[PDB]
Design a protein around this ligand. Sequence first.
Ligand SMILES: C[C@H](CCC(=O)NCC(=O)O)[C@H]1CC[C@H]2[C@@H]3[C@H](O)C[C@@H]4C[C@H](O)CC[C@]4(C)[C@H]3CC[C@]12C
Ligand SMILES: C[C@H](CCC(=O)NCC(=O)O)[C@H]1CC[C@H]2[C@@H]3[C@H](O)C[C@@H]4C[C@H](O)CC[C@]4(C)[C@H]3CC[C@]12C
Ligand SMILES: C[C@H](CCC(=O)NCC(=O)O)[C@H]1CC[C@H]2[C@@H]3[C@H](O)C[C@@H]4C[C@H](O)CC[C@]4(C)[C@H]3CC[C@]12C
Lengths: 513, 129, 502, 129
Amino acid sequence: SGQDLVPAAVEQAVPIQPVAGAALAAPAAGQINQIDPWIFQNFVQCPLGEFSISPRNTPGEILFDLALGPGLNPYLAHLSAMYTGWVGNMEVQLVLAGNAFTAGKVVVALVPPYFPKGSLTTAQITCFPHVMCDVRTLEPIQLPLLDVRRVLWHATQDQEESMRLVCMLYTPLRTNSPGDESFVVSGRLLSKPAADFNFVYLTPPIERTIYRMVDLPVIQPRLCTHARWPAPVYGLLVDPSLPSNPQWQNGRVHVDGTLLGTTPISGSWVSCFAAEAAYEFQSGTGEVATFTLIEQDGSAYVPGDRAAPLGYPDFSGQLEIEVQTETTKTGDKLKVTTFEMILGPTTNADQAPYQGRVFASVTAAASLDLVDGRVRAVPRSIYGFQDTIPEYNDGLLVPLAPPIGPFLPGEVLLRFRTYMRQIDTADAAAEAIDCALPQEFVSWFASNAFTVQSEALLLRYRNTLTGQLLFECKLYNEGYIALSYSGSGPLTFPTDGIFEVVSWVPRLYQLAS
Amino acid sequence: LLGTTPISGSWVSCFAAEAAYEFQSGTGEVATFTLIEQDGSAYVPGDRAAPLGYPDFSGQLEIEVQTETTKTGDKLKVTTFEMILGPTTNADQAPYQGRVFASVTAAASLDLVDGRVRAVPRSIYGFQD
Amino acid sequence: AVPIQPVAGAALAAPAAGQINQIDPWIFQNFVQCPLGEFSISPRNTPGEILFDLALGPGLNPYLAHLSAMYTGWVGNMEVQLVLAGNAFTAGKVVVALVPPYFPKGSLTTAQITCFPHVMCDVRTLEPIQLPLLDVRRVLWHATQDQEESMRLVCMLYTPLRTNSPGDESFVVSGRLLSKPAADFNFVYLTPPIERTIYRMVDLPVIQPRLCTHARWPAPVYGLLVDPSLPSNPQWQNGRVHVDGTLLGTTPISGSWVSCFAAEAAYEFQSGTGEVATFTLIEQDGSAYVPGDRAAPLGYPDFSGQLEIEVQTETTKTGDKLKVTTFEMILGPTTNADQAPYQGRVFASVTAAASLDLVDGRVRAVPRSIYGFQDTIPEYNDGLLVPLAPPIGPFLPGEVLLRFRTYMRQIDTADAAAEAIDCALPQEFVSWFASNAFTVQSEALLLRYRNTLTGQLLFECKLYNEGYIALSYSGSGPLTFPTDGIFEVVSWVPRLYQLASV
Amino acid sequence: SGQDLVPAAVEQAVPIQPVAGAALAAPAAGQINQIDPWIFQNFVQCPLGEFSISPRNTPGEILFDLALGPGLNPYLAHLSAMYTGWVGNMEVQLVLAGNAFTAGKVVVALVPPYFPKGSLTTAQITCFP
Ligand SMILES: C[C@H](CCC(=O)NCC(=O)O)[C@H]1CC[C@H]2[C@@H]3[C@H](O)C[C@@H]4C[C@H](O)CC[C@]4(C)[C@H]3CC[C@]12C
Ligand SMILES: C[C@H](CCC(=O)NCC(=O)O)[C@H]1CC[C@H]2[C@@H]3[C@H](O)C[C@@H]4C[C@H](O)CC[C@]4(C)[C@H]3CC[C@]12C
Ligand SMILES: C[C@H](CCC(=O)NCC(=O)O)[C@H]1CC[C@H]2[C@@H]3[C@H](O)C[C@@H]4C[C@H](O)CC[C@]4(C)[C@H]3CC[C@]12C
């Protein structure tokens, strides 16, 4: 236990008066509402209460920024489904217990209500009541988080202007360590309610709210399906020798439920389309079938913001599809035939699925006349696959999903891989098509409609049998998972684990490799 | 779960096996499919009547697998097959024991190197629940 | 350590207990180390690793795990302390929480471990961290012969280790957990001491491996070794036994039953290859054989070869009354085998057209030699179902199986060197584990194969509780070992434990 | 002189009673036998009193193991050629003054007489004082 640290960094005086909590809102609420007196005894960790200061952070980087509320406690964020209203202050600790070789200071201010958010430069964060503290402090730095308000309480709906608590990185982090390591101090943030926190009015406990952090399905990735091709997942892996910021359109959801692009909710819709065909027997390339692209069930198609019908193949290649048709010959009614369409651009085509028309063909010399009508196309095999966003118009622009990124310097995209049926002539290896998130998470996020807190979700990946955490990763709020990997060779992981969330982290959270 | 219910929607009415293309002049390549679990695990005969996702209705079924051929010009090719799921008093198919024989309508001499296959149902014929 | 009220021990059990028995007061003075109360924090560990998890009982003290054979039940608090070996230039934290005696089992994040009563001790503290372990319970007093739910301690790595390391080793931070009873530990009711228990270290038989017997083939053991080049995860069906006393598959108790079967004879003089053998198998203790949960009747062979049982033939042909000749069976598939050991249809053949006028009755089958030995699972059915044992494993990276090689009678036409069929446990270790019926604590024992006269170690192996011994061998060639030491059992370890190189 | 070490590692309490030395064996010996009162003044080094802990040592390695006797002193091992008999206890120090960058702990037990030697695993060395 070295005392070359700073143990004289106690809870300093802040220029603020004591603020009355539940004594004001007692005769304006309709009932008597006390909470359990063992909630006030121990400091438990905030849900957004995990941050990290790498030495690649400039001064003026906001480490955490969390409003006062019931979202600073796992107990009060659980009790606030039962109530509509809260008052009173909290008491927040800070575990900044970095190494004895680091050097640097943080400053934790007390931003009042109705202060405009956004910029908050480092010059003006000292003008608030603030506490300055080193990153080597042994004891936990305590600080009060008062409830400055003009109304008698706050509703438990997060649009309340309330007192924030911003932590700017004041001076940069550096180590006087004799070689090759630059330590990343990993702080935590503990909190408990003060002596006069109180909820206001009892209410039916609704789960679908705020806070009620994100949950994930307990299913292994070797069981889940793929969101760019109708197949299972066959092992996730990182690779820094690939297109690093792709621009896919299938299987890209937000973590507030809103699907982004041409992505469906059902898993039997990806790389599939349904249309009302128009067949014709040609003396050239066999048959020609135009299409009028609509949904699979029967919903109409008007070209709006999605670049294609939901579930359209968002890659490039020569796609062989299966459709059962009504042959007008005498002896057989139904037989599924195999067309082949120019799904890729291939430097020239005649198809533009943004306005609802693709054109398939099957090489057949006999006069094969088909009763035209509604059909549903499904893929069979791929020929000359490229992972490029195709031409949804003929050569024009379309409303696309934005490209995947940006990452931090040193963060690699996590890719769930599957293998498509291919038509290969000289090659004997499988074609690898990867997605940013499987379909079982898109149907989990669309069917729950979560509320994102800050910027990103800190995940883990734990093996089922050993119980060993394989890695930790950072699920951003755009539906991709970026983890920190240093090298460049393709690193592969086992697939029998299960993901599990931990906390909300900002974009500045440096991950361990 | 009960029966042979899978979890993923990409597993229903389809299987995956370790192929053995064998049987000589009946219809074509009477392949032998050692039925295992679709995630790559091995199958253990317990209490559920089949591997998970295996089709449970009577009728002849066409399945499309990926064939690593032996001829020149191409290695990978998708050959449609013909299974016989229903009893019909004579059908070499034991999914509970893990060995299912499927036939092709190919009177040629297509040599096919065996390996690992994933079955995909193209079309049933004569459906009966 | 944070808000738990003081919990009554023997002040509550006293109206309903017949006796209240005090302990010797010198047990309250010494801190004795708990079993499985040891961990290590490398800098490669992500936060959220559970360092240990151990329940309050009389199994936390070797003084009290011995005394709890004389008594009916116990009540009261323990008192643990946690040492931590770390200098002043480390950085990291460890949170030790008091999980209530429910909250059943699952993955605990770092966010959830702070919601229990907990102590967040830094990793560079000097003095040990005393903390109470109260006896929160629904009943008046627990019973010593019943593993009922009590209050656990769960220790989670809170913030990761931030250190340097020279170039090797990588600076693990070790930590131990010592305990003693509190002032109100009491036992309840004096009984006679029983031997089985459930607090017994697995004692291995004091027997050198040269005097053992092999599991697969009825031969002595001729040497234990390692070999990476073989199939690393075999699927043998003989010599498989759980440490808790459960046989896995076809493994019999006694070493006489192996590679043999007792059946009912059915002899038909054929005008083809002479005589063929087709028997009605039964269980060798005189009971019926029902095709069930195991791949074969008890004691059937499990290798890929061509066999030759002998007979006992009571022939009515004149010249000799009771004779012993030799048949020839085939165990491998070889694309032609009508062998159904599951249903009980074995197919052997005499290679002679001699008119053996054999009367059919009860026999047994002692084997003679083998032809074409392959390390492959035989055909317990033709192309059909087989409930078999799982493959042996999985091991850690760096660890390999430790086989017991024997040499059997090999009929060959080209090579003279004898094959080495091996197993994972000799049959002295199989009847020991089945009869004693131990109780698995965590995942693996930690054996130690010392020589008797020298007293020097040879290897510190690790016996998993599925019935196989691993060894952290890191080379590539087959390294053999002396076969004159004696296995000794050190302790229970978790399955993420690292041995030393051999 | 850094105080980032552990100077609060004083001679701790051990669960043992005081043991009478030469007061028992006084009326069963045949003569009056005192030794020099300057032998009791200074700590001199044991003859088997030098050990070392490299980082290639596993836990459970026995560092030293020395019975109580006249062999723990260069004075008493020299005086014990003149005598046939001894009684009483010793007082032993331990100079473990390693660097300020090392980390690790040792445990020094008090094994009673008639305890079987040999193995002495690390699980049971904490059961002694
Ligand atoms: C079954 C066939 C299509 C056969 C086929 O090619 N693939 C089907 C499969 O694999 O299950 C017919 C039956 C009735 C048809 C559908 C329904 O009647 C209504 C629906 C109407 C919209 O045009 C969308 C097509 C859609 C959905 C129809 C298209 C195709 C259907 C689904
Ligand atoms: C040939 C297929 C490719 C997929 C395909 O042909 N059609 C899929 C579709 O579009 O529906 C290959 C790619 C990788 C292969 C699999 C995985 O690598 C691992 C797994 C290993 C088991 O022993 C056998 C099957 C199994 C599952 C492999 C068999 C077939 C696979 C799935
Ligand atoms: C020829 C026999 C093979 C077994 C046999 O004769 N019949 C088949 C059966 O065991 O059932 C050989 C194989 C390996 C041999 C042994 C080992 O090499 C070493 C061992 C040491 C000494 O040389 C004496 C015996 C002993 C033990 C050897 C004697 C006989 C063995 C066991």
